[PDB]
Amino acid sequence: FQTLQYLFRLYPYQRDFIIEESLTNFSHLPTARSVSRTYRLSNGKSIQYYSTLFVRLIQSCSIQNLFDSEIVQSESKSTEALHSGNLTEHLKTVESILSKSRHEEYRIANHIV
Amino acid sequence: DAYTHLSREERQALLHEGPGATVMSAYVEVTFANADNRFPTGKSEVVLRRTIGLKKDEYSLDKKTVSKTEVINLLESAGFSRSNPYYIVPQGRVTSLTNA
């Protein structure tokens, strides 16, 4: 699942395709409780390890990593009067990126749910 | 196989009506000392019982309260006969299997 997550985050041109089978194998699972419970958690609970695959894919979900290098400047001195130097629209470029995060997370979440 | 197509007054006709107290349910239980004639040979002393209330009946095995079809199949695998059995003759009915 580590490799699957890396390929998910890095190569989106077939990002769907892995999903297309990751749930299919979900049909062939232990159908009883004593076998489904597996590797314990830190807070003291036991889960089925195959379940961590689903969250792991959206754990990647192409989170942005170019946090910097979108505005001419860092913070000003008095933002409560005017965004001096920095551009608010440049600060309002994050939602473009966040649209690639937000409006794709549910898009992946609804192929599965 | 008798007392099957019973009804309200039938499933009441076979209780005891007396002055002691109104009786609700009745039960009969027999004890067989089989050897291997009955199939579950793991039990050397099989026991059967049938309880009857005014609105319930339950067959059973050794306190195992199974349904009717299973005790029917059990008695069928043994050398019994479901319908009117030749080895049983009721009152004055002895001229049975000589004029049918």
Partner: protein, 113 residues
């Protein structure tokens, strides 16, 4: 669906404090104390037991919808209503309601089941 909802709320909230804000909703389930479904009857008897354990000050006006279940055809309602009368008997202190527990107990000394 009406069976499911009242079956769910029997353990859902674990806090009868919802009925501290919705006594009209409590008034809804009081009306269904005489439904034909023997399954929903006990649910009302279980919920109404729980409501007394915490919100204790409703001993009198609740009490009526409790003993009304002991004289019922189903056994589940009777075998449940009795055990709630146990808890109520200790927490209550008015002897005048204690006697009403006893008279309704001794009357059910003999039963069909």
């Amino acid at each position: 669906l009406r069976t499911k909802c009242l079956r769910i709320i029997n353990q859902m909230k674990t806090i009868p404090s919802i009925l501290r804000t919705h006594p009209e909703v409590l008034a809804q389930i009081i009306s269904k104390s005489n439904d034909q479904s023997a399954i929903v009857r006990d649910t009302v008897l279980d919920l109404l037991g729980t409501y007394i354990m915490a919100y204790r000050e409703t001993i009198p006006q609740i009490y009526g919808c409790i003993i009304s279940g002991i004289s019922d055809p189903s056994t589940i309602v009777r075998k449940r209503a009795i055990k709630q009368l146990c808890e109520v008997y200790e927490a209550t202190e008015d002897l005048n309601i204690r006697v009403d527990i006893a008279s309704k107990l001794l009357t059910r000394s003999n039963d069909e089941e």
